[PDB]
Amino acid sequence: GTITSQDDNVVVGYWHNWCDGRGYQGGNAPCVELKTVNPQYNVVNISFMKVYDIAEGRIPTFKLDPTIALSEAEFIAQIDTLNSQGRSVLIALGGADAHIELTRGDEDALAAEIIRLTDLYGFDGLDIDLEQAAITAKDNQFVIPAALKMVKEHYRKTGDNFMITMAPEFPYLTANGAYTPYLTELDGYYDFINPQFYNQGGDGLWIEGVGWIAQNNDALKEEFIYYIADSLINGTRNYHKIPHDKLVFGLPSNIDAAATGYIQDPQDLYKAFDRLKAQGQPLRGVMTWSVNWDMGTDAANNSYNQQFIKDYGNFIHNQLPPV
Numbered sequence: 001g002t003i004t005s006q007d008d009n010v011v012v013g014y015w016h017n018w019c020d021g022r023g024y025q026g027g028n029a030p031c032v033e034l035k036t037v038n039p040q041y042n043v044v045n046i047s048f049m050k051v052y053d054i055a056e057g058r059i060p061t062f063k064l065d066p067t068i069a070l071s072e073a074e075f076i077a078q079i080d081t082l083n084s085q086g087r088s089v090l091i092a093l094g095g096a097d098a099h100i101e102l103t104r105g106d107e108d109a110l111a112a113e114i115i116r117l118t119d120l121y122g123f124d125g126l127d128i129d130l131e132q133a134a135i136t137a138k139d140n141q142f143v144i145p146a147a148l149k150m151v152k153e154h155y156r157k158t159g160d161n162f163m164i165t166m167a168p169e170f171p172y173l174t175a176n177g178a179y180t181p182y183l184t185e186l187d188g189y190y191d192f193i194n195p196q197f198y199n200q201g202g203d204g205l206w207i208e209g210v211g212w213i214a215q216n217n218d219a220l221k222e223e224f225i226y227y228i229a230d231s232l233i234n235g236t237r238n239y240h241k242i243p244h245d246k247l248v249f250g251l252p253s254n255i256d257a258a259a260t261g262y263i264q265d266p267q268d269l270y271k272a273f274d275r276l277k278a279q280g281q282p283l284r285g286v287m288t289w290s291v292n293w294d295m296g297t298d299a300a301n302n303s304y305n306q307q308f309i310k311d312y313g314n315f316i317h318n319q320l321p322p323v
């Protein structure tokens with residue numbers, strides 16, 4: 001394929017390489033064809049590159065789920081189509097039960113496999129989306145950055161920007177937190193970070209004048225968004241710094257997609273994002289788990305009807321470009 005990278009704001013959505021996932025509230029996530037994904041998701045993350053069976057070896061790979069009933073050829077064409085629309089398709093490394101437990105020395109083979117898949121499917125980059133147990137498993141903190149540097153450099157040689165993103169759960173981004181080796185090793189290689197501001201229950205931050213602001217408090221959601229992002233983009237309040245032009249706010253699509261973190265009132269995001277913009281530090285966009293959930297159903301089989309991309313797609317795409 002042709003490496004197709006993002007120079008302006010993004011709306012990121014994950015795409016499930018499986019069918020009929022059950023939700024946190026009993027709903028259903030269909031498998032969907034790439035070509036059915038709403039075009040306002042201009043970064044689509046194929047979930048997941050993983051180890052399928054450890055008897056196959058330590059190096060994760062990607063195998064298109066045959067239940068989805070696309071041939072490799074048809075999947076590849078759909079990626080070419082997205083690329084022709086100016087949209088990126090990343091491979092998301094990790095996910096639940098991925099069995100990624102790499103040993104020092106594995107970076108060469110992991111880099112070779114990323115390059116292979118990239119060239120074959122026409123992926124535009126990789127998203128680091130490790131499960132909690134993987135973040136510090138074995139030599140992952142060393143191997144995964146070492147491999148991605150070699151991948152970045154390989155594609156830089158041919159004038160291509162192989163995108164590198166990550167999806168840390170936000171508690172792991174405290175200063176010296178478990179995800180910080182990935183961030184420091186890959187500083188100047190990663191394009192943007194899309195943390196998960198969901199599934200962390202009552203984790204949060206204390207702000208003098210406001211109080212305790214939890215990720216699951218729907219009365220203080222503007223405050224949560226504004227203050228957690230302000231902390232990250234400035235490296236304050238004991239958070240690792242991620243520059244504002246490289247921070248994308250990750251969210252559940254609806255209450256089926258995650259246990260906690262769903263934004264009940266989209267105006268809380270609009271206002272938080274406008275406060276960050278007004279101080280000269282606008283964010284790079286939003287991300288969601290997941291496009292399948294946005295296209296999914298509740299427990300009564302009522303369609304979620306793309307509400308996430310309705311709420312946020314125009315809002316983000318009509319912002320000024322970065323820099």
Ligand code: NA
Pocket residue numbers: 001002003004083122123124
């Ligand atoms: Na591509």
Ligand code: NA
Pocket residue numbers: 218219220221222268
């Ligand atoms: Na509120």
